[PDB]
Amino acid sequence: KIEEILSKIYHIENEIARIKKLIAVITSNITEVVDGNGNKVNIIDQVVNTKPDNKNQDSLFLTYDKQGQETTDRLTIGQTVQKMNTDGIKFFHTNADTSKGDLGTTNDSSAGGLNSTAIGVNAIVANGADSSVALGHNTKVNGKQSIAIGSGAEALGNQSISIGTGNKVTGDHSGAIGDGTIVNGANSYSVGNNNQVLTDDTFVLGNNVTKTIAGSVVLGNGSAATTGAGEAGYALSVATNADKAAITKTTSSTGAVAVGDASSGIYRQITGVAAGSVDSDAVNVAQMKQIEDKIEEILSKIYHIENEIARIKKLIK
Amino acid sequence: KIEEILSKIYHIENEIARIKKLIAVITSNITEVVDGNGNKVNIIDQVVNTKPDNKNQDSLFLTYDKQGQETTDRLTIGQTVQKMNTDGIKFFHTNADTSKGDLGTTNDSSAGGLNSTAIGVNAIVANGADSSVALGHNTKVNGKQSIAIGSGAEALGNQSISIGTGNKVTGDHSGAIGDGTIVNGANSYSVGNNNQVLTDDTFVLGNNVTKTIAGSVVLGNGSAATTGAGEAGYALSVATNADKAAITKTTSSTGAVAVGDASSGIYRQITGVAAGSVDSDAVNVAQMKQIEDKIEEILSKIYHIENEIARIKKLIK
Amino acid sequence: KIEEILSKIYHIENEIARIKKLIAVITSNITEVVDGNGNKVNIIDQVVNTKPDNKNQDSLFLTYDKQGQETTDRLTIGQTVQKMNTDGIKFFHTNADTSKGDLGTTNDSSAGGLNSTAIGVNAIVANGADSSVALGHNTKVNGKQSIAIGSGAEALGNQSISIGTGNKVTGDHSGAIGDGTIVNGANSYSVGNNNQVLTDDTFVLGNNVTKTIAGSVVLGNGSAATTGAGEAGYALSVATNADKAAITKTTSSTGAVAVGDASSGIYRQITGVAAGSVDSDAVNVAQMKQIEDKIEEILSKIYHIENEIARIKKLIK
């Protein structure tokens, strides 16, 4: 039947028009979608940058340059993400060499401690160094609640602080601010350069200090504490018993305050010193001068007495 | 008409071949696109990792492990992004517990101040603490232009600095480096452990220091400043009027330098001290020895005078 | 031939059914893919957030708020990435103003040195300042292996350390902790506020200190070191030759320890001082009292001698 054939052909013609219609809309249907605001978003434009422009501050592909405070627009979302990943995010940038790390294949930081933070090239917090902080190239922290900041700073004791270039703090509850200093003493602190602090409860504000005593305080370039407890003070042997005990009562109890190093010819005046009042207060030159002046007054009475006696001796004869 | 039917069939056959052609290219057309370099990019491969490989340093899906300096390759771009987001980017890693924060549901840092930076687990800069820095687990900064670094460091005054474990600095323009120290004084600084600094313009380089006076400086473990301005120096009552005023001229103006604590039997020698020159310079043992030696020379003239007088008295009779 | 026409029509009907089948599966085929775990992933859901929910901690679109420790769920992957990029990742947040930077169009940090790390708004490490660290608003570091932390801290010398508000350290191997301090001296350190340290190997633990001598140590608010090497100690002119040389042997070698400033009426007692033993040890009040007491004993013998002599003179007549 012709009419049966014609009807099949009309139907097919209708199916074909409908097919072409479907085909038409597929694309726009697959790539164009509505986000949760009701904005139509094109999936392709979210993944591939349709118009790169380093100056377009609204680009979803934008990166913040690690130096110079400008931006760079990337080609795909993955590129953007990996640039962030290696060159930094805004306000957090590390400019790195191509070295190998001490622990693994990268030169990443390594935050090994629970609640630890590690920042910078080869900045390492050890496993177990909990609540610790490393910030800087080659920093290393092995202690709990410890801090290393700087180039090669190491904070290796518990509650250790190491700020500056290449200080190494092994003492617990200890620290060093400066460069090239080592602190092995516990409860000991150094401010300055090239110090070595082996003793406990020791403080150094100085450079090139290497001789200390526990409990000591060393002040200034090249000073040295070499004395501690039990140094008998200088006393006049012609002194009374009560006066010798008052001196003895002030006998040293612990490491000295050192302001120089007589060994090596290093001596500092102490200036701006108020007259002492009580037994263990320092004495100033004014207080010594009153004594000197009295010595002179005594000497002058003696000279006169000697004069009198000489005359008396002659008068007798 | 047969020929009319045949023609419709040929046309349809042509439309069908053309349809299949269109269908063929759709895919490659939808997913394969050209970026701004003219590189063909496959959208799917930008979003889903076609070949995960922890060692493939060019992977767009790569993450930098928070410890150990190795990498991990992720399955999708969103996974990569969220790993960066929680485990860190290269050179910026915090290894966190699963705690709740003090402010909100996460244990994130919180940079509350304008131009502030907050880093680490529960590291908090308060609203209004502008230009401030917190770096470390449980750090808290409430002051403007303030710095807390370490485990539980708090910098609560304006221009306050707190570096180490659990120091708390409330004073303005003040700071503490060490562990367990509190500084409430304004314009006051402590280096050391378990100090308490309540006074202003006070400096401590020491541990276990808790007694201070405004303007004082306390040096060493257990030292204590308990005296300030207006301490009348020790003076010989047999001294002249000019000599008493020279002493009085050097009377203390402010808190002492304390190197010990006579109360508790703590005393330190001061060593390396150069001979004083002017009135408010400290005196050393060498300068006291010259006086002692003169006392002996005086005593020996007196002994001889007494001898003479005794003979004179007998000679008279 | 009818039968030839019918056969072409049956074939076309079969092609049409097959086409519609292909069309059906395209979508699901293009967008639904298998990742490297064998999980089926929908490409669209990786790029566009199908259900935003600020509380959904598994969202691939989640951001960590820069303050308050809560999260925000974003609409597309690019939004997420750029929020991370500008507002921070978890544990690394800077809350920034809308300023211009000193170097470029943004207010980003700038890590100019190899292996340097720069963090915070307008935190700048210069080109060539290698292995250096800047952390804080307006920090600037120009030296190698240098550290600036705080608001406007500058570390401009090599191995320079500057922590606090607006300190400026130009000296090499030098540093300042505090606020408003300048250190131009090399190998010199200041703890405190508004100090100016022009000299080398100089240490200040104090505020408002501006007069120093190389090698000096200045302790406390307003103290001033104005003397160095070669100060001849106070000596009794009535002293022996050996005693004058012992004093001369302790003559100052370098900058003083200053605890006050006699110029401006500033004087501090030094308290807790143990009796000195050797020549360059400080002397305390106890050691001066033994001398004073002996002066009195001498004066009393002299008074008696004078008495005797007066009687002798009368007895003779």
Swiss-Prot record, chains A, B, C:
Coiled coil: none annotated. Residues 24-287 are annotated as: C-terminal YadA-like head. Induction: Part of the ataA-tpgA operon. Disruption phenotype: Loss of rapid, irreversible adhesion to polyurethane, loss of both an anchor-like appendage and a peritrichate fibril-type appendage on the cell surface. Cells retain type 1 and Fil fimbriae (defined by FimA and FilA protein respectively). Can be used to immobilize bacteria on a solid support; cells can be removed by washing in distilled water, and will reattach as the ionic strength of the medium increases above 10 mM. The attach-detach cycle can be repeated at least 4 times, each time the cells reattach as well as the first time. Expression in the indigo-producing Acinetobacter strain ST-550 leads to cell adherence to a support material and subsequently 5-fold increased levels of indigo production. It is found in: Cell surface; Cell outer membrane. Homotrimer. Interacts with TpgA. Insertion of a human rhinovirus protease 3C site allows isolation of the intact, folded passenger domain after protease treatment of whole cells. The protease cuts in the tag as indicated GGGLEVLFLQ|GPG. The signal peptide, cleaved at the inner membrane, guides the autotransporter protein to the periplasmic space. Then, trimerization and insertion of the C-terminal translocator domain in the outer membrane forms a hydrophilic pore for the translocation of the passenger domain to the bacterial cell surface. Seems to have 2 tandemly fused passenger domains; a long N-terminal one (residues 59-2904) and a shorter C-terminal one (residues 2905-3561). The C-terminal passenger domain is an entwined, elongated trimer about 450 Angstroms in length that is rigid and yet able to bend somewhat. Responsible for autoagglutination, and for adhesion to abiotic and biotic surfaces such as polystyrene (PS), type I collagen, polypropylene (PP), polyvinylchloride (PVC), glass and stainless steel (SS). Adhesion is much stronger than that mediated by Yersinia YadA in a comparative assay. Confers autoagglutination and binding to PS, type I collagen, PP, PVC, glass and SS upon expression in Acinetobacter baylyi strain ADP1. Involved in rapid, irreversible adherence to polyurethane. Forms an unusual biofilm. An extended, surface exposed fiber binds to quartz crystals, PS and glass. Belongs to the autotransporter-2 (AT-2) (TC 1.B.40) family. This is Trimeric autotransporter adhesin AtaA. It comes from Acinetobacter sp. (strain Tol 5).
